[PDB]
Here is the input.
Amino acid sequence: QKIAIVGAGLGGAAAATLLQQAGFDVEVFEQAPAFTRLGAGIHIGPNVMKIFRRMGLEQKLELMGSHPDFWFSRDGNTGDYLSRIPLGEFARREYGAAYITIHRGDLHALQIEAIQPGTVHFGKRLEKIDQVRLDFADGTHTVADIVIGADGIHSKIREELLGAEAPYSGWVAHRALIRQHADVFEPCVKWWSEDRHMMVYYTTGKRDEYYFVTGVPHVDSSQEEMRAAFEGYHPTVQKLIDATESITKWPLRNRNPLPLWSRGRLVLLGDACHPMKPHMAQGACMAIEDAAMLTRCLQETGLSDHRTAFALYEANRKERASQVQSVSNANTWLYSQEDPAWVYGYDLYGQQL
Ligand SMILES: Cc1cc2nc3c(=O)[nH]c(=O)nc-3n(C[C@H](O)[C@H](O)[C@H](O)COP(=O)(O)OP(=O)(O)OC[C@H]3O[C@@H](n4cnc5c(N)ncnc54)[C@H](O)[C@@H]3O)c2cc1C
Here is the structure.
């Protein structure tokens, strides 16, 4: 009995690792010709560190990541503190694991290196879908008993199931890494204004590398673009823009379709399953939660009963996914002094299936 995973992103690589460690036969097929360490940071909450704990990766991630004492929300124009969300040791004791911000590329490499060698295949772009046959752009094919669609917002699995999907992006994310101003650079801060924001944090425990990602109404960017976009923001933000060397700009969708969890022998996770706006910045975390829950369900039913496994998987994920959807719709996440326990203290492995 064979599982094929389409996409070796954070969601698909986590599923591969968890499913192989559960003793299942798994191969992963990734379209990219090569592996790239994304030059970006990422947030990993305690709820997902407990999943990395099951993989055996939690201790390594703690050594690599920055452990902010607080998440600060600050008014972009005034620098007023809108929220001082306690993390650090409090997070460790209250939620049962660390909150970290980490180099996304190095996390991603570590995650793929946890997969069994010789089971991850690059340059395998899925072009078409008892059993499931997968046809790849390079002319080869493979077969499996179930297929996991972890192929992101442009999922081919989703497209094969539902058709073409209607076509637009009126906002972007600027991303930059910064490597004199350390006294005013807090380890995890979100600067807000009425229609845009900048999220800033360190990528490592060394704190020698400081990352920002924005969301702004709207390839290589430039400092002139950043300055106009953030005209009026606090001196700290201007110093960040001034300290950049290279800035890139990424398009964000104005809308997303409704969740698709499974159909027949095909099951979906992460952005392929429940794409949504990155307001909360928990999408990768939700992808890894999907992988962990899906693994728990296939562990209950075995692969011979994939229909029950897929039903249990949707049943045990749809409410939490829907909560994240509605909070991210409000676009209020940590804007005020709120209790984040429902996200960070969530106990994925204690949930009765
Ligand atoms: C600005 C922005 C900031 C964010 N910040 C955070 C954060 O701080 N913390 C967090 O948890 N989340 C964050 N997210 C969300 C997160 O990036 C995504 O939710 C996450 O990447 C989804 O993971 P995934 O595995 O489902 O899909 P992806 O990461 O998109 O991976 C999909 C993989 O499948 C491959 N693939 C695609 N199509 C095919 C095909 N036909 N055939 C074969 N392979 C294919 C792809 O090349 C890719 O490698 C952010 C998102 C945005 C836009």
